[PDB]
Symmetry: D2
Subunit: 105 residues, 4 copies
C-alpha cells in the first residue's frame, strides 16, 4: 500500500478453555530519519471483550527489520469467554481487532 | 454482543479530485454523560499528520458522525477512522481522490 | 535540547461560569521523512476532571513553523465544575495537564 | 479529589552510567460498579529523549487495588545519555514525564 506502516493480525489458534495462540505481523515499517528511523516497539495486546478497559500485554519487542512477526500463547483465560486482541506499533498504530471465544471447561 | 463499544466505518462517497464525504457510526456505547466521537483523516502516506473532520459529544446510540472534507490533493490516497474518547477506534477506511 | 518535541501549557484565563480561555505552545517540533520539516497536528483537548475519558477538542490545527501557539475559548461549560486540559501533538505527545474551576455565577 | 485517576511519578534515583531506578504510583483509580474486581494495566515506559517514538516497556502489570506502586531498575543504558519515562494506566492516562541523564562513568 502507499502507507509507510502495515500491520496484519491473524486468527487465534490452539483455542482451549483457558488459553490461545495469538499473533500478527508488522508487514511494513518504512524507514526514514527520525520517528521512523529506529524501528519500533511491537506489542501484542489482549482483553476480555466485555472489558476493553483492562488490557494485558502478551508480548512486547523492539524490531528494525520487516516483516516482523509477534506471537504468544496467552494463558489463564476464563472459559467460554470472548476475547479480543491487536498488534500495536509504537503504541500509536494499530492492526484491526481480532476476536475469539474460549471453549467451555 | 459482549463488547460495550462498537464502531462502524463507512466507505467514502462523493469522491472528487479535491473532496469526499466521510462518515462512521458509534453503534454501541454502553453507559448519561455520553462520549466524544471524533472523525479523523490523513494522507495515507503521512499517518502522523491527522486532521479532525468532526468532533462531537453524543449520548444516545447508535450515533453517526460525518463531514465533507475538502482541499484534498488529486489522485491521492486518504484514510480515516472514527474514535471514541480517543481510546477506541474503528477499522480504517481508505479512498483515493480522482485525477483532475 | 535533546528532545525533538517540546510543549508548554499555560494556566486558564478569562474563566467565567460557562467558559474559559485555554492555550499552550509547541516550542519545538523536529521531524521529517525527507529533507524538509514536516507539519504536525496540534490540538487543545479538555475534559471535566470527574470524567477524564470524555475528552473534547477545543482546537485542532496543522502547523509546520515553530514555536506554534494554540488557543481557544471553550464555551458551554458547567458552572462551578473542575476541568482540565492539555496540548497534544499528533495525538501522541502531551503537555502536562492544567486544571481550573468554572465560576459559580 | 474530583479526578478519578491519579498517577504520581517519582524522579529517577540510583542513576549510574548504565542504569537507573524508575518508579511511580497509581494513587487513585476509581472503578465502575460493573467492573469491580477487574482492575487496570499499569505500565512503566522509558525511551531515549532523542527518540520518543520508540519506547521500551520496563514493567507492565495488572492491578485492582489502589494505591498501587510500580518500579523497575532499567539497565544496559547508554552512558551520558538523556532518558525519559512515564507511568501509564491502560496505555491511555499518563503521569507527567520525568527526565534524567545517565552518568559518563
Amino acid at each position: 500500500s502507499v502507507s509507510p506502516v502495515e500491520i496484519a493480525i491473524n486468527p487465534a489458534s490452539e483455542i482451549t478453555a483457558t488459553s490461545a495462540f495469538i499473533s500478527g505481523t508488522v508487514t511494513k515499517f518504512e524507514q526514514s530519519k527520525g520517528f521512523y528511523g529506529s524501528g519500533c516497539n511491537i506489542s501484542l495486546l489482549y482483553w476480555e471483550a466485555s472489558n476493553p478497559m483492562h488490557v494485558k500485554v502478551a508480548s512486547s519487542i523492539s524490531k528494525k527489520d520487516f516483516p516482523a512477526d509477534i506471537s504468544a500463547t496467552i494463558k489463564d483465560l476464563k472459559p467460554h469467554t470472548t476475547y479480543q486482541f491487536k498488534v500495536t506499533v509504537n503504541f500509536y498504530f494499530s492492526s484491526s481487532l481480532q476476536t475469539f471465544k474460549t471453549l467451555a471447561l
